[PDB]
Structure 1
Amino acid sequence: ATVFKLGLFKSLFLCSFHDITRLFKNDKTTNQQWVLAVFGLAEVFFEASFELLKKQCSFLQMQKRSHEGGTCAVYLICFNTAKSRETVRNLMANMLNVREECLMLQPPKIRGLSAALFWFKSSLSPATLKHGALPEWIRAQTTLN
């Protein structure tokens, strides 16, 4: 089913989930920055999650799209504390009120222009929910040096 996942994502955000995330084959690997793809998220919970994550984050950007084929949302989170996938997998699964089977968690692709812009383009749209100062790896890759 993971196949129908990525396909749906790319379909809504016009770019492969991979083009914005590096791999972490171990759910125990800890890290602060995480990219989250959610499916079937309820509007209310989306709004809610925002406020709750602000408390424990340095930066946070949320976007949500949908259509007659299914809904989805993306999260760029910078937890004040390093969290393993399990840790996050648990925290969010509950916070968003969705089964784990509806979550894709991979660290961001901090080294890549294509990616770095995806976050910028979003930070432009008003629909997007932002909080905190843009991560360094993002501002740098998107500014005339």
Structure 2
Amino acid sequence: GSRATVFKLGLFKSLFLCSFHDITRLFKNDKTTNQQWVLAVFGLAEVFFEASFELLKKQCSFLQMQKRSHEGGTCAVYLICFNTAKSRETVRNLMANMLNVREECLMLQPPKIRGLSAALFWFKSSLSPATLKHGALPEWIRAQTTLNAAAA
């Protein structure tokens, strides 16, 4: 299982100071699917994180990732928006064949299309040095904080 629990959320907050319930919202139904997803993964080495942008940036319309931390536990936060929708079990198997960790530290929920912080978080992350973007941002963030007149 390990949909999204209080423990991962606590260290997520301790690192990026914004919740996972405020960037996504709720499904405990591990059957309901979606193409877009969010993810934060724990206990990762930076080399395979940089290679994670490498590997994933085949098959998704966008991909954002950012990294921490301070001597207390690493929370590599992803933003994943695949090409064809895949369930929490399928994307769970993908990422837990990706990151050489347990099924524990996965954070799978669809992103929330109406919400301010839900795109402010990634809009701030987009300027971070270790952030790795590919192509157009998904229409949710790329709707909430952008889609504004490029040159009036």
Q: TM-score, normalised by structure 1?
A: 0.93
Q: Report the CA distance between 1:126 and its aligned residue.
A: 2.2
Across the aligned residues of Structure 1 and Structure 2, the Cα RMSD in angstroms comes to: 1.7
Q: 5+ residue gaps in structure 2?
A: none
**Contact map agreement 2:66 2:128 (CA 8 A) in 1:** no
SS at 2:98 equivalent:
helix
**Contact map agreement 1:36 1:104 (CA 8 A) in 2:** yes
Flag as ranges the 4+ runs of structure 1 deviating above 4 A: none
Show the counterpart of 1:32: 35
Task: Render the CA deviation track for 1:114-138: whole Å, top value 9, x for unaligned.
Answer: 2111111111222211111111221
Structure with more of its chain in strand, by fraction: 1
**Contact map agreement 2:113 2:144 (CA 8 A) in 1:** no
Q: TM-score, normalised by structure 2?
A: 0.89
Q: Report the CA distance between 1:31 and its aligned residue.
A: 0.9
SS at 1:140 equivalent:
helix
**Contact map agreement 1:45 1:97 (CA 8 A) in 2:** no
Change (3 A) 1:65 1:144: same
Q: Report the CA distance between 1:142 and its aligned residue.
A: 1.3
Task: Render the CA deviation track for 1:53-105: whole Å, top value 9, x for unaligned.
Answer: 11111100001111121111111111111000000110101111111012121
Q: Report the CA distance between 1:52 and its aligned residue.
A: 1.1
Identity of aligned residues (%): 100
SS at 1:21 equivalent:
coil
